[PDB]
Amino acid sequence: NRMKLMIVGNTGSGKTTLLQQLMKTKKSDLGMQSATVGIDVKDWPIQIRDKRKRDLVLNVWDFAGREEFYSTHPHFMTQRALYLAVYDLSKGQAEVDAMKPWLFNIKARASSSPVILVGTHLDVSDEKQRKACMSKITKELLNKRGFPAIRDYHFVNATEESDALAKLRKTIINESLNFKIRDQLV
Amino acid sequence: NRMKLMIVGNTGSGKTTLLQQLMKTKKSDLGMQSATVGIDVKDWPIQIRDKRKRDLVLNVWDFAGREEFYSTHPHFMTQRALYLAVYDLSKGQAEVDAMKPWLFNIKARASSSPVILVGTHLDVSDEKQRKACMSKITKELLNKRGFPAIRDYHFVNATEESDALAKLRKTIINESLNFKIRDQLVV
Ligand SMILES: Nc1nc2c(ncn2[C@@H]2O[C@H](COP(=O)(O)OP(=O)(O)O)[C@@H](O)[C@H]2O)c(=O)[nH]1
Ligand SMILES: Nc1nc2c(ncn2[C@@H]2O[C@H](COP(=O)(O)OP(=O)(O)O)[C@@H](O)[C@H]2O)c(=O)[nH]1
Ligand SMILES: [Mg+2]
Ligand SMILES: [Mg+2]
Ligand SMILES: [Mg+2]
Ligand SMILES: [Mg+2]
C-alpha cells in the first residue's frame, strides 16, 4: 500500500501553493514515472434543453489503469494516510476554530491517520495572530480524545523555500516512513 | 447529489482521449465553475538521505475544500457512480476477455453500479475484429449474474465527432438521469 498524503482545509488557505513548494526540487523538475496522470478528476457540465430542463453536472474520474482504480478501494481511502490540515494564519485564531470540524471529519473518515497542522501566510501575519493561534492549538487541538493525533504544527510562507518549510518537508517524509513502519508492529 | 462517472480500463485503451471528445459536447459553454481543480492527485517521488531501502513515492490528494472531501465519502464513491468500461477494439477479442476482471472489480465496489461498454480505435479496427468483439460481448458479458448491468455497448473513433460518439453521449446522460430507476424494478 503506497502511503497517501491528504491535503485538506478551506478553499484559498494555500493547499496547492504549499504542495507546489514542498515538491519544488527542479534538480529533476517534477519527473513522475508515468507518461499519463494516474487519476484525473474533473466536472462535466451537460446542458440538456431537449430533456426536462435538468442541467446535469457529472464528477468524472479518469483512471490510467487497474493499479489506480485499486488504490481507491474504500480500505485504502480510509487507512494508510498522513493528513495536512492547512489554514490561513493571516486570518487569525478563527481559522484555528475552523480546523475543528476538519479534525472531526478526519477522525470519522480515517481513525488511525495522524495530522500535521500547517498555518500558511506567515509572511502576512503578525506576532499577535501567531501567538493567539499557537495558544488556541496547544489548548484546544493538541492531544484531544476525539481528534486525530497531531504529530506536529508548522507556520510557513508557502510561496518560498525556507528553514520552516524544509522542516515541514522533513516532518512529512519522516512521519510518512514512521507511520508505514508502526502499523506493521504488533 | 452529484453522480460520478468512473472511466476504467487498461492503460492505452483511449480513456482520456474518449472523455476529451465527449466533453467537446455541443460547442457551447466551456465554463468549469471553480477557478481551481476540486481534487488534484499527484505522485511525489522523494529521495531520502537515510540509507538502506529508500526512495519513497507519496500519492498526494489535494482537496479544494469541504465539499470535495465530503464527495469522496465511500458512500458516494461506491453507491453514486456510473462506469464507462473502455477497451481498444483494434487489439481484438482478447481485450473483451480483459474487460472480465474489470467487471468483477466493479461489481465488488457496488452491486448496483451500471456499466457502459465502449470499444475505441474503430477507425483502425478490421471488420472481423469488430464482429468477434460484438459476438463475445453478447455471449459472455451481457445479462450475467455476477457482472454489473451492461446498459449498452458502443464502438467509436474516440479522436473525432461521429453519430456513434453522440449516441454514447446520449446513453451517459440518460443512464445518469435514470440511475436509481432500473435497479428499483428488481430491488
Ligand atoms: N503571501 C502568501 N500567500 C499565500 C501563501 N500560501 C498561499 N498563498 C496565496 O493564497 C492564494 C490561494 O492559494 P491556493 O494554493 O490556490 O489555495 P487552495 O485553495 O487552498 O489550494 C494564492 O493567491 C496563493 O499565492 C503564503 O504563505 N503567503
Ligand atoms: N486511431 C485511434 N487512436 C486512438 C483512439 N482512442 C485513443 N487513441 C489513441 O490511443 C493512445 C492512448 O490514448 P489515451 O487517451 O492516452 O489512453 P488512456 O491511457 O486509456 O487514457 C493515444 O495515442 C490516442 O490518441 C481511437 O479511437 N482511434
Ligand atoms: Mg488548490
Ligand atoms: Mg479518505
Ligand atoms: Mg489516460
Ligand atoms: Mg467506486
From Swiss-Prot, chain A:
GTP binds at G9, N10, T11, G12, S13, G14, K15, T16. It is linked to Parkinson disease 8: A slowly progressive neurodegenerative disorder characterized by bradykinesia, rigidity, resting tremor, postural instability, neuronal loss in the substantia nigra, and the presence of neurofibrillary MAPT (tau)-positive and Lewy bodies in some patients. Homodimer. Homotetramer; when activated by GTP-bound RAB29. Interacts with PRKN, PRDX3, and TPCN2. Interacts with VPS35. Interacts (via N-terminus) with RAB29; this interaction is direct and stimulates kinase activity. Interacts (via ROC domain) with SEC16A. Interacts with APP; interaction promotes phosphorylation of 'Thr-743' of APP. Interacts with MAPT. Interacts with RAB8A, RAB10, and RAB12. Interacts (via N-terminus) with RAB32. Residues 1-179 form the Roc domain. Ubiquitinated by TRIM1; undergoes 'Lys-48'-linked polyubiquitination leading to proteasomal degradation. Disulfide bonds: none annotated. Changing T11G: Decreased kinase activity. It is found in: Cytoplasmic vesicle; Perikaryon; Golgi apparatus membrane; Cell projection, Axon. The chain holds residues 1333 to 1518 of 2527 of the full protein. Changing R66Q: Decreased kinase activity. This is Leucine-rich repeat serine/threonine-protein kinase 2.
